[PDB]
Enzyme design. Sequence first.
Site: not given
Lengths: 457, 457, 457, 144, 123
Positions: C106, C156, C158, C160, C184, C186-187, C277-278, C310, C317, C362
């Site tokens: 809350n 991955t 593809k 997706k 993988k 796909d999510e 997977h996030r 993930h 960066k 990834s």
Amino acid sequence: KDYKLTYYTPEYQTKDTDILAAFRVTPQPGVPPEEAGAAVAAESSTGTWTTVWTDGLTSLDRYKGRCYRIERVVGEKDQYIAYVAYPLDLFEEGSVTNMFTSIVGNVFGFKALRALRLEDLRIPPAYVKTFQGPPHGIQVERDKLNKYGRPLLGCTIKPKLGLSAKNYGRAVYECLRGGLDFTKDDENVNSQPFMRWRDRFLFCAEALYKAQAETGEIKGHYLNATAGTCEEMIKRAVFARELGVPIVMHDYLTGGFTANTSLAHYCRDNGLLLHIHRAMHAVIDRQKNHGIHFRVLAKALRMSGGDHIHSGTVVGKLEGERDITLGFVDLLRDDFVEQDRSRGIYFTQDWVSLPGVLPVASGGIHVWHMPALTEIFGDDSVLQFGGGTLGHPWGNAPGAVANRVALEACVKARNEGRDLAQEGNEIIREACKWSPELAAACEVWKEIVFNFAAVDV
Amino acid sequence: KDYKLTYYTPEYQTKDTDILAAFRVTPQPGVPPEEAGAAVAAESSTGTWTTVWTDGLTSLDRYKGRCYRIERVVGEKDQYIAYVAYPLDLFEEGSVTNMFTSIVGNVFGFKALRALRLEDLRIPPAYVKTFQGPPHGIQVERDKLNKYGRPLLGCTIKPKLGLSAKNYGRAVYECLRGGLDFTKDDENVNSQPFMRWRDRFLFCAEALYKAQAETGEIKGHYLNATAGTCEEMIKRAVFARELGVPIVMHDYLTGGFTANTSLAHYCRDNGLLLHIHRAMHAVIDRQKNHGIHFRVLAKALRMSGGDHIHSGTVVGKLEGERDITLGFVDLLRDDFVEQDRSRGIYFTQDWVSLPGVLPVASGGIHVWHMPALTEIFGDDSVLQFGGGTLGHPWGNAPGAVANRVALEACVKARNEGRDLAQEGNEIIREACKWSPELAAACEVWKEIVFNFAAVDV
Amino acid sequence: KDYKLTYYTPEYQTKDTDILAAFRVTPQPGVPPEEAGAAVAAESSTGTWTTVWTDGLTSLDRYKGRCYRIERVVGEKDQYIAYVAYPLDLFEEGSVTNMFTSIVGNVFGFKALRALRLEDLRIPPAYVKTFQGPPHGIQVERDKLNKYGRPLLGCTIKPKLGLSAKNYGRAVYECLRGGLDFTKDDENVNSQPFMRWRDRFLFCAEALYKAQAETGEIKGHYLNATAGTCEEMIKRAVFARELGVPIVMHDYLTGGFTANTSLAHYCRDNGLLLHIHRAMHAVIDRQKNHGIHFRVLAKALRMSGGDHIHSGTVVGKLEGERDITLGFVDLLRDDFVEQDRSRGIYFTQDWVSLPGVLPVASGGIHVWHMPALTEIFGDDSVLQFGGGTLGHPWGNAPGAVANRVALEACVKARNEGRDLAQEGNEIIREACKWSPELAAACEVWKEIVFNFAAVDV
Amino acid sequence: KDYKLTYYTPEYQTKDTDILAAFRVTPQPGVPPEEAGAAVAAESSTGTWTTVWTDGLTSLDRYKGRCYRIERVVGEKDQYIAYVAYPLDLFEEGSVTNMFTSIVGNVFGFKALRALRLEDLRIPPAYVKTFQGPPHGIQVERDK
Amino acid sequence: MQVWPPINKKKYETLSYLPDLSQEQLLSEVEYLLKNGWVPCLEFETEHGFVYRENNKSPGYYDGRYWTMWKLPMFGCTDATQVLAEVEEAKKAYPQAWIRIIGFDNVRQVQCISFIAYKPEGY
């Protein structure tokens, strides 16, 4: 009871979520079309001659079927096509049983009508999404079986009833080893004194595995799981799963929609292909004036679930009847089928990605019919033979080889740009040169059509 | 294919274990009766146009259906009655599904025929013993309910589709508290957006228990268990069992025989009475030339299982049609029904103690029809009203009271030696004196039949 | 409500059993830091503006959260770091669901705050021991797979969403056979009209077994078990177990913690590796002022259970962001992670032997990024490619070979004492000489970085 | 990756079976609205910067999300409302979990955007019918 | 009357019951794919030329359905000779391999063609 002033609504604009029905009405003498069509809508929804107090504790105009249009039939007189619209809320999600109960439950017995026939139904996308549909469908099936670029081939084991479990398996092995993809349990063959189901499943599995090992191609045998109760039916499918076989079978009309949907769900969850036989359909769909046309029974099967469905034969039919057949074949295989009254398609039907069903052509099919069948149905079909394999002079295997060679000759010719419609007989003639099996199957045919024979070199 | 010389056997003496079938055949022009009847027998058994090698690995004459007799129909020409005999071995024990698949599976679509109609079937004692039959039957049902000496009374909750669970229960309580024994879920009412099944079962149980507590008589409400799958259907019956209610309901033709037999077995094992609704029957049994007569569909239900079955109404029917109805009513209730072509009974049927099914009369029944109904059907019947209860000026309870009083007046009069056939109207007239409820229900009727009214003192 | 005098306790000495929370608070203008931090502690524990009689039937000071410290954020003004301590008793053992409900349930909606962000949590050893944690963890996983001395490789498939079950399997086989360890799902790929889950599991198992047989190395494919209900989710994992495959997948945030913990337990009991997977994390963890930082979501996953997770990419960066990433990567893999504010680690975290989770890198990863990735993450990581394999000019297998060769070249160079940081590009250059596959993948890169090409001899 | 020329389709006429999404987009400086809205649609469906061979073994235009409209927000600047349409086939029947994974799974972390907020969703009747919904609902509850 | 051989008659699906396709017929088949807009692709296998069941025996599961792809699907291919050229190159590199040509349809994400183009010695 004057329904006409409440159930006949020509100003009604159909909603995207409505279930539409096209009825062929033959009213009793004196009964007007508008009143007949309103009686049809009334009886298959709220069904009220007048009014009772309970009708005020809800809104009658919310759950009523509405006849929004009438059309006189060009041919016969006293015959009209009534269009009725039913609210989405009247139906239980995922239940073909409820859909049939609401629409065809009581109307066919109404006195104001002499005869009634349900010709078509428009199943809206919102209702279609509540059904699982075919366990697998055309595409997945071809992928599982690794079969592409040609119609699939099957044959019936005869006699219908009578053979023992081991003899049944023997015919299965001989047919399959000759080039056929599938063999079939008779629709009547379930479990009887002459052959109990488990023994049949056991010997047929042995036979199909041997033929697969011998040929290098994936084989299947429709093992009939139709039974007296739901429990027995599932118990039979469970054993097919234990044996690791690819396909089971069910008589959806005699078994019923409630049982068929259960089997279909089971087949999806366990990776079994489901072959459907339409036994008893002709007591419902034959007469043009009374009953339910096969296109509706086919739509119901695609919703309830099935990967294959018997859809008759096209051999010896007038274009006319042939167009009607191609009409329901599209409704079974395609995703979107636009309205077309010439082929008996009263409504545009959107299937919203529901898997398509593979049509099975059977009934007096011989090798010389191969060219026409391949052209009419295309690759996505299963062509079944009875006496064209079993009745071959040399037996099951050579009979299966003859049909496989004949089919491949037609596919090759088609791919090479040849017209199967006018060169059909010649294509089979050439094939007879390189196939003793095909030649022996074409003997009586050569004498009549070509007035001979032979070969040369 | 000349079937006649193999399937037409007029010298055949039927065995005690044979399943006999009486088909009404309408052959195509040119096709002889003997050949048509042989085509019917052939197609519904071994089904062979000629011969294949597998037919030698068994005895064809052991599993073949045989047309042993042909009879020309007195009325129309081109219409014959073909009698076919089927070996006991062709059928799976306890499976109505298999029986229908073998007999009516493919014959109705044969080309040599223009129309085909299965009129009757002789189920031999040896096949009857493989079925459980009704979960309880007439006698046990009366004992469980403690109701004797009169027809049972039921009413339909209207509108068909539309009401909510709590409102449905309210009408149930009002009807039952007024003198009715049973209330009915509409055949279309399963589980929908406007009313989910579990809420209905819950409120209807509360309503029926209140009415039972208030009146002191055992009450019941046919809770519809018809569903999309076998699992859902059983799941619904299981909850009825948890609530401790006496009776459930099923639409056997739309649900199917496989699912119905499963429910019937469940009902026997759990003490639930099973009410059967015949929705969709008219698409099969209406036309005199094509289909299956209701007497066969009724025999199938008695074998598959059901304690009650809707069997139409006798009101406004010519003796003629009335005799046909009494014919199948006997086939449903009696242990032994002797052959009688005047009432459409083609075969003597021995039921070997299989429980009898209670016929349910419904369709435009009003209080003034009570005398004729009580006389025609007798005590072993259930009389259902729709607008005769809901349409009563004062509501459900007073409407239920009117029907209960009217019925008891008829029973009393009958027991006192009065002829219900000629004193019917007078019996209802006298009853109106001591029943304000009955009087109000007879208003429009008094004005026409008696040209008044009233009472005196 | 003056929380400050009850919930702000700067003299509080945290206990070994307390759950500590570091909140980044942005109070409304006028609201003091001490009062804001006390409002945070109050709302996420006892939550009382004043006092009610029930507060005397217990000890408020026993179950209250306490803000024991406030720190001004060096950068922005109006931003503080509030430290809160929660008693061990407030939490249900083994439930991440309850931990999140109590702490972040809350407070984020409190008016006195403009924005709130949970930066870290100190999970005491006493609470850690009530969780199973990862089904297997880094060490056991390497042992099961027999893979040591290098990062694992995945790719991955593809697009997706869109491919069919058989085509999906084809890409799986081609990628795996080329040198990759994992492929993988796909999510988003669960079960849809274009590809039902069971067909996918079946074809992907066939594909991974073929590649394993061909290469001699153990292969795996993350089969997505995410579903609408817990029952469906388990039903999917059960089939993966029947097929004997090594790893399944789950979207823990969209699926939820309750469902994820159930799957994790199932995976431990059945020997299945669990890839997490996030999906949806960025709606929660992106903004610096409001939400929950990924390091907390990562801690929650390690407790709830998962073998892989993930954790984004480090490519492109600023050190800065890179340090934050290495911060949570340590929290996922290590047993003991000492406090270090420079890497966003607000608390010393002791994991008391709870298995470590393998981080999955990834997002725009190409072969030329291999040197930096191998150096930054080390061996205990999984590097996933998308277009670096599928986008290779020659296809999936050659694309997989290029990535496998590039990775091994980096491992060899590292082991030989070379600095991956400054010799990275050269290492890939040399490798291109002995690998046509690697050379073709580096074309556009060679032209820009080396202004050529080529080889010599 | 120029999504705009493939995912931004202002001529698109939404179907009765489409799942529609209204996103409040705050793009990074320099990034045009059309390109931002196309990035949102692309990432939450097929998600392709360019093309791989597998995209030819199906029809990309059949399973792609489409930004069919952009609207500038009256109040603040640099804030737009992007309307995206998703095919019914992308979703698993009866699974809110899958619906959220497909629509809000990866887009909120896209670099071309500074902030993203899902404001509304149009759930078509065809997808609604695959859900049971409330165990009872208002009416039944009052009755119970 | 002749007896169909129980050995040495292994098949490879569509067209395998017809005499071995001549280069001209092989070329006509490829043109059918192109005329319909189907994307041609080649697959080959060196070890298991027929399906078997080693890893699982549940319904619908068989090993040996997948073969290895020869290069990539030939998108944009307009000349059927380009396809025929690849078959020559493939059997040149792997003479002991079975080679087949498959076709892919986009309206449907499906494969809709599959016929053997080359078989190793003694097959």
